[PDB]
Symmetry: T
Subunit: 170 residues, 12 copies
């Protein structure tokens, strides 16, 4: 494997998780009314998950010999996903579409890393697989709320418990 | 009391609880959308309760000298209640009607056992009373969601905790 | 059974528990001095018990098709027991007599309900029996402090834990 | 400060909390249907909070030299807020308006006490501030459910935990 | 009911539990070898249960107006069951027969009390029923170890937890 | 990968776990006597494990676009393993052989799924690996009890804790 | 050391603890009134301690090659202390004197065993010392309640916790 | 504010708490007899509170640039309150008067500090307010035991838990 | 008070806490060697504290009628403190100076808010005071590590527990 | 005492515990079949105990001025007990004899140390006594499984809890 | 033994522990800088230990018939050890020497008491031995920090847990 | 795969972990002084980890049909890594170099096993990966203490918790 190529893929993924933590705070506060009361807890659970993903990725970057960029504005411009802006018409349906779009991009990011490290870098592969578990969970959540397709999941116990990536956390 | 007559009433009740555990799994996964998100947790709580009822009934059957049928298909054909099939038009209202119908049949089953053992079999009477407590709870839940009649109950703390039958469980 | 007659008996019992919670607060604060320090903890335990009894009775009233009165003053006038007023001479002996009188009336109230529902309404009978357990406990407490007759009970661990009615509480 | 004037302000506030505990029980049981299932847990959380506020106010009244009125009907007539009666047309919107009206009156009551004791009675000021924290929370809850204005709060963990007034509770 | 007749039945039952606690200590220590290692834990569980039964019966005797005999030797001579002496040939089979004989006598004792108090003394009936639950458990344990008849029970979690009589214990 | 082919392999595996839960209940109750007391706890641990495996498989089936069959009898006929019937001569040796045969079939089922999804479906591969961990454990348990070959395992702490599949459970 | 002489000293001590458990139950129930409410908790703590002492002594007797007597009446006649009978005039002062007399005899019993085994039997010496710790505690409790001599101890946290002999208990 | 003047007020307060911890140990051990058994637990609770107050004050003194005196005898001579000596006639009434006198002096000390720092030193004001909460509690305790004036407080759960100053403790 | 002026002061403070969370991650990873091992835990504790401060400020901004800026880069440019860049010569002394400079700016920010809201906005004042408690703690930590001036504090128990602002957190 | 002579006795004892940890692992894995299932848990408990004994002895050796040998093979040759090899015919009886022989040698080792340090080295004597408690326990376990002599002990709660030496462990 | 001579030895030891608690507070706050950060936690652990030793000694003094001196200044002048003053040049090396000197004096004090009570006063001997365990621990800590001699101990879990004297504490 | 070749690779790895547990005990006790106090806790954490690795490897060896060597000296001679002897000049730098050398050899051992079993033995591959996670952690710890290269890790919570291999432990 090319370590430099792998390092630039991991830093871009970490930037996406960091900005997602900020934008999901705005989306949660605008899901108001009787209909929005249901989805407030689901958004909160997803937002705390992505903060934990940022925590897990940083130590692996430094083990491989990389470093974070000096200035925070340069870090935000390196995100592999588009910003989840608040829609111009902030209705429940338009908020749900923005969340679904962000989740499908995250699934593609971590699928690409697994293909690159399969059978070559055992520790990096295992960490990417653990995060991919929780991203697929979030994608099924929102597609069931927007369309009618069954997903097989219901409410968690406590937001941000992250059962797949806990062994990587301090 | 006729022990043979009492034994056949208890085995039929145990079959109904066992099949209810399977059918409620299908019903939970099809309660989708924004409206269905509310009732997913209530269905899950009821499904875990009926699994515990099956656990409590089996030891009493063997104390009285009975046994379960050899083949599982013969056991399913002995259920005292009709199968809770998924409706042809799976809307929220049609799912709620199926759940309400199943609950009212369960209340009748355990009311009949209490009349049979009143003042004659103290241990069998106490177990039937404990299960009847939780069945009346579930019936009031669904009738309040379907009609507008007040019931007096709200969300539990943890699904399947079964506060009335715990002393019978291991 | 006559459901209307049973409903009016349960609403009157709930009113007695609600007013008892208010009056026992006054009685506790006036048991002063070295002698009163002993009985302060016993009064506190009894007061928290009766609050739990009010919590358990309300859901059963709504299951049977009843409702609470609109105005709170009309609810207070329906109590099946006399008000436990602070005596004109507030000594330790006179406070103890008021407490004993209130407890014996509560025992009579729940004994009457059990006779009415014996072998006819299994769920209502079980709830009335659970509360009657704790009322008999309180009656023995005060009669031993006032007279010299042994009772067989000593200090609880934590006030208001209510070991007989917990399975009815949320 | 005039102690007599301060005492009459605290007793009136305690009466409002005591009657609010009764009336919110009726309002919770009438929030039925699919829409009402969402708001049942919020009403329950608010009702348990106001019971704790009554518990905290009573000891301070006796420290300052006051006492509760002898008869419970006279206590109910001293409440500083109007009774939260069940509306004639009990729909979800009409129930929400009654709850919002009660909360705004409570905020005004405790704001007035803080102005009176600022820099003169440190212990009374601190207790009034703690209750005012939770009243402002409840007001933002209901105004977001009725209108569309964002509030910044979502579901609590356990009803009645009261994180601001716990240090005053036993 | 005749209170004097009921009191003498309860005192005799309490004597049997007290002596059973002593004799089961001897039986446990003589179940040696590879075969006896299995049954040591079952005997220990039963011995701790009967100590709890003695604890529960004493307060009810004093509530009804009775008292324990002055001298401990007179108390031991009032037991309603025969002494569980260590057999002359202390083999595993002979120890098991002694245990089975003691359990069947206990079941008969508490069945008789329930018939006497059915529908007349609600509190005494409930306590007798709770102990009868655990005695029937112990009887099924030993008959399955001696004969081959299935019983439906296996190892408990912690000896002496007594899940049916806990609400009567301090 | 062919999603339709993968879906039919997962549904057949889920049917085997569901029927295993029923048949192991019969086998546990017939392991009587002094010799059978040892193996009762091991059978109980295995039975609770397979119930958890059914819980983990169902959500993944719905994520991939599958569904459970409508009728429960059709579900039972799809099991990938033969029914673990009670032997005609129910001795300890014959019960042990039936258990060993069922375990070796389960190991083959999940080994086949891992080969199919290796390096192509990361989430499905990880779930199949987790269940395969516990199946290999159970196989070593029974082969050591039947033959004399050492296995390296001894008693668990609490039955059904399932340390390998917990992160997939709710 | 003479093992036979040591064995007869340990069996007599175990008999005293066993009978003390019975007699203290009677003494606790007769400490009535306002004055007796204080000492009820102290008697309860001492009674549970002596039950634990009986539990600790029995295993050591069997290690040294002794056994308990066959019949329970012969065991009671071997106690090294006189029976703590209820006084003819059961006042608080007369009950306190009986308790003090029993405690001073227990201190003498275990002091004698320590002198016999000092520097010869390390395990027997350590067990006798542990029990002597708690007996000296109880003696100081009662002498301070009867006379005015300060003792240095106040209320325990939970009765029967036995902090000195716990490491000998199961 | 004058920092030097504020520093000398805080050091004198810390000396009073340190000496109070020593003198209350003597007072607790001399509250003997049946009457003194009640007040032993209250004195113990107050003594542990004042030890915590000393712990909280020391870090703030060093933040502001002060230091403790070199020799411990000079520290004891700086206390702002008089020593709580054991009275010449150590009866329960005379001990209670000494405790009441010490508490009223402590209330005056911390009231003076709050007036000095109001609106000028936010952190010092908050710490002084927290300690003043618990001193007012202790004053009401003793005045109710000595006179008959109601106070509104009863027994704590665990001595020295200090619910108002915990956030300042390590 | 001017609500618009207060809102712009709170948003700027929230931006400083958000960027501090990013920059302290870089500073912690560069405190290497034997000397840096000591200060790694202190930096980690401070970094988790400032994340909690961001969590507490956001709900109050929305209660007052404000909102966060749309784009994350605009939010970062509004911080009231300068960026804590990694020094060009990353030695232990130069890292310590950067940390000390950031802490003194935070103390000034929250002191200014308290002066603005004193006696006018009770809820905003209390929240600002709670954060100011922990900022003064951090300032004393670093000044003692850089200079020799005593501070009065030592190691916490668990990083990020935040004992002063917990009641504001979910 | 001769410190050099005491040091060589403690190092030899530590070597025996270290090698016992290795050899008991082999013995546990070869106790197969239905008979061996009983004794697997007892061997596991003893093996974890001896690991804790090695942990406790090492700090005391360094306090007295000793050190461990440089090479691990020289350490193994200093053991005061013979190696517990797997018998040539590995049956249950032959394994039990090897375990019994090892335990009796350990009892002799620690009895010798206590005689040497009695009344001269209080800290070394106390540590040797604590380990001797658990060795006598293990000796009674195996002699009861091999012969029929009663021992007075049954199954522990959790292996390796070591209730006598815990205060010496970290 | 001479009780008067033993009493004066115990009172002098209690005075040393009480003054040590004050002086160690000053020493902890002056161990500043990067080097002092390591030893702050060790000093804190030792200071909390000596407070517990004072708690354990006081009850034994009153059991033997002694009392504390009336005035606190007379108590401080009776200490058996010299005051641990802050050195004129407060460097890390000079602080360490003061701590080491205080610890060696404490070891001598409790060694002397054990020689006096060996085989004559079992309860006093056991308490002196327990404290001597922890004093020897502290002595080894400081001698390893000052010189290079290995000690065998490392960081505790929680300061002031005192594992050897806990059974003497309330 | 060749099972014989795989078995000899696993036995050699288990020998290295067993000897590492002994040698790290010597290294920890010689890291003295002010500088060594920092690294004592890190060495302790690593030593407890390697003991857990030995526990996990032994059961897998017996599942595959292998066994441990008869004599412990032959087991020690099979280690795949060189002995970590104490250096002739035991300074902090020389101890750190020995630890770093041992860790890099362990990383190579488990990397080799993963390459051998990739896609052929799923259970053996997963266990080797779990241990490789923790070995890479330890390698980064020591290289950051010796050189200045950042690693990204700081202090654990409790030594020997082993978050990656726990699911393999009992
Ligand atoms: Zn993410
Ligand atoms: Zn059911
Ligand atoms: Zn309120
Ligand atoms: Zn019994
Ligand atoms: Zn104070
Ligand atoms: Zn050992
Ligand atoms: Zn000390
Ligand atoms: Zn390792």
């Amino acid at each position: 494997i090319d370590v430099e190529k792998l390092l630039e893929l991991l830093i871009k993924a970490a930037a996406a998780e960091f900005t997602t933590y900020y934008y999901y705070t705005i989306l949660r506060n605008h899901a108001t009314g009787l209909e929005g009361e249901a989805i407030k807890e689901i958004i909160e659970d997803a937002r705390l998950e992505d903060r934990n993903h940022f925590e897990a990725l940083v130590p692996r970057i430094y083990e491989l010999g990389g470093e974070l960029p000096r200035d925070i504005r340069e870090f935000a411009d390196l995100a592999s996903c588009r910003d989840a802006y608040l829609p111009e018409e902030p209705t429940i349906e338009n908020i749900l579409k923005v969340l679904l779009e962000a989740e499908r991009c995250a699934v593609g990011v971590y699928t690409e890393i697994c293909n690159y490290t399969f059978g070559k870098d055992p520790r990096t592969y295992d960490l990417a697989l653990a995060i991919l578990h929780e991203e697929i969970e979030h994608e099924a959540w929102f597609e069931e709320l927007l369309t009618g397709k069954p997903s097989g999941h219901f409410r968690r116990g406590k937001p941000g418990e992250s059962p797949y990536v806990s062994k990587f956390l301090k």
